[PDB]
Structure 1
């Protein structure tokens, strides 16, 4: 696949609201399709990535090796950048973590409606 697909444009940055600097570190990937009737290489890549169950959240690093693997299965996954508004959780708050659909992982769950 040509790199031009993954070479962003100024309009793309505005559309996705992503700054070219300070790239995001962690990827969120979920399988949205079946590997049945797909070639063996596609099947193997999904198994390696661990996305056996569909709609299952997975934590992955935004590193070239992971990026290369994700590109192979790009059409079968949804990529969302992980956000840490409150930062990384501590040992005390490790049990209070919760990942929202917005892509933000809160380190404290207060059981209060956002409303």
Structure 2
């Protein structure tokens, strides 16, 4: 029941129950120390060794099951692509915002 969303929940987080996002941005916010051995393994299986380092993962049921076990130790933010997926040409100009948007052009200039 915890993972069954409510209509008010969608409004607060601004996520549609349909057209779900594909990729999770997962970061480790707390320590694995003092946690049961099984929780330690899941973190290393998911690659969340260094805290405050975002990792890209699939939003699929198998990944979700592991992500739920370490639900309390991480922050999940849906990846967003305002300008679309990066291409070969723009792969070297990518930059991830704190908002969760992977822009394909990084100029370091005023937006104007």
Q: Place the TM-score, normalised by the shorter chain, in its bin.
A: over 0.9
Alpha-carbon distance in structure 2 between the residues aligned to 1:75 and 1:114: 37
Pairwise CA distance, 1:114: 4.2
Pairwise CA distance, 1:113: 3.0
Alpha-carbon distance in structure 1 between the residues aligned to 2:67 and 2:106: 31
Pairwise CA distance, 1:105: 0.5
- The question of 1:45 aligning with 2:42 is answered yes
SS at match of 1:78: strand
**Normalized per residue, which structure has more helix?**
1
TM-score normalized by the length of structure 1: 0.94
Alpha-carbon distance in structure 1 between the residues aligned to 2:10 and 2:104: 28
Pairwise CA distance, 1:61: 0.7
* Cα 1:114–1:101 shift into 2, 3 Å: farther
Match of 1:21 in 2: 18
Pairwise CA distance, 1:112: 1.5
Alpha-carbon distance in structure 1 between the residues aligned to 2:71 and 2:110: 35
Root mean square deviation, CA, Å: 1.0
Query: Structure 1: which 5+ residue stretches go unaligned?
Result: none
- The question of 1:33 aligning with 2:69 is answered no
TM-score normalized by the length of structure 2: 0.96
Moved over 3 A (4+): none
Pairwise CA distance, 1:36: 1.1
Aligned length: 112
Which of 83, 93, 110 in structure 2 is aligned with 1:96?
93
Pairwise CA distance, 1:38: 1.1
Which of 105, 108, 111 in structure 2 is aligned with 1:111?
108
Alignment of 1:55-74 (within 5 A): 55-74=52-71
